[PDB]
Amino acid sequence: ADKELKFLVVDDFSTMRRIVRNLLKELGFNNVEEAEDGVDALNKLQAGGYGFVISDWNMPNMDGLELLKTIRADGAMSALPVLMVIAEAKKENIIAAAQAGASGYVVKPFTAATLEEKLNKIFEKLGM
Amino acid sequence: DKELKFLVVDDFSTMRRIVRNLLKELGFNNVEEAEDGVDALNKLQAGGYGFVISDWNMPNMDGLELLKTIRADGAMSALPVLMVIAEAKKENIIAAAQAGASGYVVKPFTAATLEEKLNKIFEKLGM
Numbered sequence: 001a002d003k004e005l006k007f008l009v010v011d012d013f014s015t016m017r018r019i020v021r022n023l024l025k026e027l028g029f030n031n032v033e034e035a036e037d038g039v040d041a042l043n044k045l046q047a048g049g050y051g052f053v054i055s056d057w058n059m060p061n062m063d064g065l066e067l068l069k070t071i072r073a074d075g076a077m078s079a080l081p082v083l084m085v086i087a088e089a090k091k092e093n094i095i096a097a098a099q100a101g102a103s104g105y106v107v108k109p110f111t112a113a114t115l116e117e118k119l120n121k122i123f124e125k126l127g128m
Numbered sequence: 129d130k131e132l133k134f135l136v137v138d139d140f141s142t143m144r145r146i147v148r149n150l151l152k153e154l155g156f157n158n159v160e161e162a163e164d165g166v167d168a169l170n171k172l173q174a175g176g177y178g179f180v181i182s183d184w185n186m187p188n189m190d191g192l193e194l195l196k197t198i199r200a201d202g203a204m205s206a207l208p209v210l211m212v213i214a215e216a217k218k219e220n221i222i223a224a225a226q227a228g229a230s231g232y233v234v235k236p237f238t239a240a241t242l243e244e245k246l247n248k249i250f251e252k253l254g255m
Contacts, residue, residue, distance in 0.1 A: 072222055072225050072226070075231075075248055075252070076252050078225040078229075079225055079226075079228050079229065079230075099219075099222075100222065101222040101223070101225055101226040102226070103226060124200065125196070125199065125200060125227075125228075126199055126200075126205075126228055127199055127200055127201060127202060127205030127206075
């Protein structure tokens, strides 16, 4: 992929946002911005130029699943890649995410190697 | 350009003629036809198309299989793809977005509906 792909990392926990940012950076991706809930996320997405969204499941104001749905329903950004971050490999939560159009999901905590592999799978389907 | 070449994909020839007639009515006269996903790739491979309009259900290779094939290919990856679905099933609308569709329209539709769908796609693409 283009090393300049612009990512948005969304989590209300500042430490995790910083952790993910470090992992992306280690993978060669330095163009990353943060948001702390789905509302903040949506306000930032409107400026434009984002190519990928990495979002936690649980957040105040607007959670992960609601963030996903909004993007999926928006004409200008309906096809934006969205990787959902979840706390346990719970079949039923994973199902909720697939039903909402998630591009992929990852279980936290995760290593750089796992992140790389989940990104690479989304890239290949979208010819990124 | 009103010279942008479309590929219209559906196994029902009558629906293909309709779509081709709605395009002419909008000013687009450079239109080709394909009967299934297989036949469509066969043409897209040969080059120079600028838009795909495809039905959801077709034999051999359906609309979602076609989109997926297109999106994974180097060259054809950025081609605009408008999916035609039979009813507003939320399930289909979402699977088309997760797969990279450019837009969707519910059949039967009008020249009017079609035009609005095309303009939003051209505007988001900067075409």
